[PDB]
Amino acid sequence: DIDTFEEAFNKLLREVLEFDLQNPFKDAKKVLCIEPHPDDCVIGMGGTIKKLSDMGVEVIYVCMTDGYMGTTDESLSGHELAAIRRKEEEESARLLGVKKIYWLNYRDTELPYSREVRKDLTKILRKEQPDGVFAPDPWLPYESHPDHRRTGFLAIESVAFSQLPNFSNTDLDIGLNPYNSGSFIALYYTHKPNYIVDITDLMELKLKAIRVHRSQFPDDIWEKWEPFLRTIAMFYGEKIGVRYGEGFRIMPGLFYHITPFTDLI
Amino acid sequence: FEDIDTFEEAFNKLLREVLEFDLQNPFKDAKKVLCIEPHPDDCVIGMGGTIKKLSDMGVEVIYVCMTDGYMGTTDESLSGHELAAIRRKEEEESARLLGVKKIYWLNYRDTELPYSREVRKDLTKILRKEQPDGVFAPDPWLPYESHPDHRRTGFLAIESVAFSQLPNFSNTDLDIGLNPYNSGSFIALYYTHKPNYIVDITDLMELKLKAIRVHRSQFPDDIWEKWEPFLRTIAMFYGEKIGVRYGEGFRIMPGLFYHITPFTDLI
Amino acid sequence: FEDIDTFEEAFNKLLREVLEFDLQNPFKDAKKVLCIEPHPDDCVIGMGGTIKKLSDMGVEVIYVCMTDGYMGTTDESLSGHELAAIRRKEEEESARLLGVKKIYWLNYRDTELPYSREVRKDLTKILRKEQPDGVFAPDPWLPYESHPDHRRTGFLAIESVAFSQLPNFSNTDLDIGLNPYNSGSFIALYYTHKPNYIVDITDLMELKLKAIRVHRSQFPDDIWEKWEPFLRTIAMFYGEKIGVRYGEGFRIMPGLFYHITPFTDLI
Ligand SMILES: CP(=O)(O)N[C@@H]1[C@@H](O)[C@H](O)[C@@H](CO)O[C@H]1O
Ligand SMILES: CP(=O)(O)N[C@@H]1[C@@H](O)[C@H](O)[C@@H](CO)O[C@H]1O
Numbered sequence: 088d089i090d091t092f093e094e095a096f097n098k099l100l101r102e103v104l105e106f107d108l109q110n111p112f113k114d115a116k117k118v119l120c121i122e123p124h125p126d127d128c129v130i131g132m133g134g135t136i137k138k139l140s141d142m143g144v145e146v147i148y149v150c151m152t153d154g155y156m157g158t159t160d161e162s163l164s165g166h167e168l169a170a171i172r173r174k175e176e177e178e179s180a181r182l183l184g185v186k187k188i189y190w191l192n193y194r195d196t197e198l199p200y201s202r203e204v205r206k207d208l209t210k211i212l213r214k215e216q217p218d219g220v221f222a223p224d225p226w227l228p229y230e231s232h233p234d235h236r237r238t239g240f241l242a243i244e245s246v247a248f249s250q251l252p253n254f255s256n257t258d259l260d261i262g263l264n265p266y267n268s269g270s271f272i273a274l275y276y277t278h279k280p281n282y283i284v285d286i287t288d289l290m291e292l293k294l295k296a297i298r299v300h301r302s303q304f305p306d307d308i309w310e311k312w313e314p315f316l317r318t319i320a321m322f323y324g325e326k327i328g329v330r331y332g333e334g335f336r337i338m339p340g341l342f343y344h345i346t347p348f349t350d351l352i
Numbered sequence: 353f354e355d356i357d358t359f360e361e362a363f364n365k366l367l368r369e370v371l372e373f374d375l376q377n378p379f380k381d382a383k384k385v386l387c388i389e390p391h392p393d394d395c396v397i398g399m400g401g402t403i404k405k406l407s408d409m410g411v412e413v414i415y416v417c418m419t420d421g422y423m424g425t426t427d428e429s430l431s432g433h434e435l436a437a438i439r440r441k442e443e444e445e446s447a448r449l450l451g452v453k454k455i456y457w458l459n460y461r462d463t464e465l466p467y468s469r470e471v472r473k474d475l476t477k478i479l480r481k482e483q484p485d486g487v488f489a490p491d492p493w494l495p496y497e498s499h500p501d502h503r504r505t506g507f508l509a510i511e512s513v514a515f516s517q518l519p520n521f522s523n524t525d526l527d528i529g530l531n532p533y534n535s536g537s538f539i540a541l542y543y544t545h546k547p548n549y550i551v552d553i554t555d556l557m558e559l560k561l562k563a564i565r566v567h568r569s570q571f572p573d574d575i576w577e578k579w580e581p582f583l584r585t586i587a588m589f590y591g592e593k594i595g596v597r598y599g600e601g602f603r604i605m606p607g608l609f610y611h612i613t614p615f616t617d618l619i
Numbered sequence: 620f621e622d623i624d625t626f627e628e629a630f631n632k633l634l635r636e637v638l639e640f641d642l643q644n645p646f647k648d649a650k651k652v653l654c655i656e657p658h659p660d661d662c663v664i665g666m667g668g669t670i671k672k673l674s675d676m677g678v679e680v681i682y683v684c685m686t687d688g689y690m691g692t693t694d695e696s697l698s699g700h701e702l703a704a705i706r707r708k709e710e711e712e713s714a715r716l717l718g719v720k721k722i723y724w725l726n727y728r729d730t731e732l733p734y735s736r737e738v739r740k741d742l743t744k745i746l747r748k749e750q751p752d753g754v755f756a757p758d759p760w761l762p763y764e765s766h767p768d769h770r771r772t773g774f775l776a777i778e779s780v781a782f783s784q785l786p787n788f789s790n791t792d793l794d795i796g797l798n799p800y801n802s803g804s805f806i807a808l809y810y811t812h813k814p815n816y817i818v819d820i821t822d823l824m825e826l827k828l829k830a831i832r833v834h835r836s837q838f839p840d841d842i843w844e845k846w847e848p849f850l851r852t853i854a855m856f857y858g859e860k861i862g863v864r865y866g867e868g869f870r871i872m873p874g875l876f877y878h879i880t881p882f883t884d885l886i
């Protein structure tokens with residue numbers, strides 16, 4: 088048929104796959120933002136969450152773990168800390184217009200990589216039938232937190248497998264349908280974004296909603312984290328020549344499997 | 353070697369002279385090879401053309417299919433049991449087209465391939481029995497590869513080809529009369545973004561695509577609408593790299609380079 | 620910091636003023652370090668020159684060896700139990716040439732290092748006991764690193780260095796009187812393809828190779844014909860990077876950059 092690989096690829100994307108990065112969140116009514124820990128959705132995409140909320144989109148958190156391990160305060164146990172972080176998360180998400188939060192309650196530092204966790208995410212996908220799903224990019228270089236890696240892998244896997252009636256089939260038996268339905272997966276916390284949201288306007292709000300997680304951001308930690316977080320927003324922004332941005336990686340569904348030229352988007 | 357001037361000269365001496373490495377004709381003396389696939393259809397999809405060419409050269413090509421394909425349908429009235437039974441039929445006939453001897457079915461459930469000592473011992477049992485001169489398997493470093501059965505197959509293949517050579521590894525194999533693996537001239541990895549050896553499959557493409565469609569349960573008309581162009585686009589990606597129309601890609605490296613090597617990108 | 624104009628300015632200030640990240644003399648002040656190796660011989664192969672230099676300045680080098688090297692022989696008359704007892708002695712001898720000191724043996728089996736909270740807890744206990752100023756471990760992101768003990772040592776060492784600081788993590792340690800890991804100034808990854816700090820080991824190269832060859836079970840004469848050139852070439856790859864003949868490379872980054880950082884390649 089076509090002459091060159093470049094023609095083949097271009098036709099693949101453009102016409103066969105209909106890939107469009109100008110407004111990929113344009114028709115979404117319901118989205119899941121999957122975070123490994125309480126606070127990750129806000130650090131990694133809180134500005135974008137605000138913009139979706141404001142636009143009439145329903146934003147639903149699925150938080151994989153409970154934040155149990157995240158303090159050096161020897162007077163605060165993991166149980167007490169987890170209770171405090173659910174409150175932190177609830178308030179921080181109100182500020183961003185966040186509706187609802189599914190807490191999976193795996194212990195922080197202990198998120199399994201297993202069929203079980205896939206079934207939990209699958210149950211939620213089948214219940215809520217979102218149009219889109221956000222999750223950390225499991226390929227981020229030097230990402231040393233297993234909760235992060237595992238979340239990203241489990242999300243992408245679950246978005247696929249929830250579509251298969253023979254996978255976690257008990258779901259169907261109790262009246263759920265397979266996942267439809269979703270228009271997309273977008274990965275945040277990524278080195279290779281190919282879609283950037285300007286949040287220059289929302290950066291102060293984002294910084295405030297982050298700070299609401301006070302257990303995680305006492306004064307002396309913020310002396311480092313605020314510069315760090317502005318510098319990351321500047322990394323993403325510069326890619327589209329704005330001051331503060333949030334970066335997403337989006338790809339056709341086909342590309343997450345056996346594709347040797349994924350770097351061409 | 354202690355006298356060699358520069359790193360660049362050392363690397364070329366190491367690669368060519370000490371390791372005797374070159375990609376002129378990697379499949380040269382092979383009488384027998386294993387093709388390790390995660391799911392029924394991966395062998396034909398990643399390397400069907402090469403399989404036919406090896407068959408044509410009188411190489412015994414043997415499949416190892418890690419999983420049963422149980423999950424791969426959206427048809428709500430087809431159980432995974434029934435689908436597995438189907439996909440085995442489909443693979444047997446697909447393989448027949450490519451002159452394929454024999455298939456080992458490991459029978460792990462699709463989406464549930466373990467990454468464990470147990471599965472390496474299964475692969476080792478086969479490598480010690482068959483004593484193949486080469487083993488093909490997916491590159492588990494494929495960027496954005498998001499199927500755990502694919503990544504796990506590839507890492508398990510590579511580890512097994514090494515560990516199956518150690519007599520204290522799965523030692524009961526030896527206690528029942530199997531020898532440690534050797535024979536093995538090579539490992540080659542398909543479904544790869546960094547191929548260094550390309551096989552021209554130009555006038556095999558139509559046979560390759562036919563052998564893929566024999567997996568009907570996977571490739572109905574509406575799926576084929578997208579997948580035929582996709583499969584053509586991939587083969588052109590590889591084919592272009594050596595200036596032919598359609599190709600299949602493999603990454604092949606000295607044995608040493610699968611461990612502590614900081615310059616694997618030079619090949 | 621609200622006012623800076625460019626990403627490039629923000630990043631320079633972040634690194635130099637906020638994090639005071641310095642790659643000029645990263646081991647300057649260290650009095651005690653841990654070198655974490657998947658198998659016996661990996662400290663010396665990966666960083667023996669460096670270990671000797673640290674020992675020369677009076678730094679106390681402590682090994683933590685994750686496995687017992689049980690599987691690493693092709694000799695059918697040597698069992699894994701006998702091999703592991705030999706390798707323990709070979710490592711004591713190798714380490715004594717480099718000025719080490721003390722070895723912690725985790726004793727997991729070679730090819731079966733778990734990736735789990737348990738192994739994190741073993742490392743966390745050493746860290747809390749020893750309170751080292753610096754920790755060395757393989758780079759688990761090395762391209763094509765196909766030995767699972769290696770990827771898992773690297774991941775677990777980085778995880779443990781962070782989690783051993785958290786009092787709710789493996790809390791029984793503190794209940795027996797250990798404090799959280801307090802002391803470290805640094806993590807350094809060896810066996811790396813993206814080193815950003817190189818120790819010149821030109822003078823030490825021959826000591827390194829001698830202390831490697833003391834692991835005789837691993838390096839008989841026919842293996843050493845391939846391994847000596849491999850090792851020299853690897854050292855020259857690192858060396859060239861600072862204009863010397865032979866070097867050892869490390870990747871060293873600010874602690875923040877091991878998490879959620881999209882610009883790790885700017886160091
Ligand atoms: C920005 P984050 O991913 O939420 N920070 C996490 C925190 O949630 C977690 O409790 C802790 C212990 O695992 O590791 C920290 O690095
Ligand atoms: C080209 P393939 O790798 O074999 N197609 C697989 C199919 O085999 C499998 O049953 C399904 C569920 O795991 O995932 C699909 O992604």
Ligand SMILES: CP(=O)(O)N[C@@H]1[C@@H](O)[C@H](O)[C@@H](CO)O[C@H]1O
Binds near residue numbers: 661
């Ligand atoms: C240089 P090394 O990392 O120490 N060599 C290891 C050796 O220690 C181990 O016993 C064997 C079996 O796992 O695999 C070899 O690849």
Ligand SMILES: [Zn+2]
Binds near residue numbers: 123
């Ligand atoms: Zn997190």
Ligand SMILES: [Zn+2]
Binds near residue numbers: 390391
């Ligand atoms: Zn497959």
Ligand SMILES: [Zn+2]
Binds near residue numbers: 657658661769
């Ligand atoms: Zn090792």
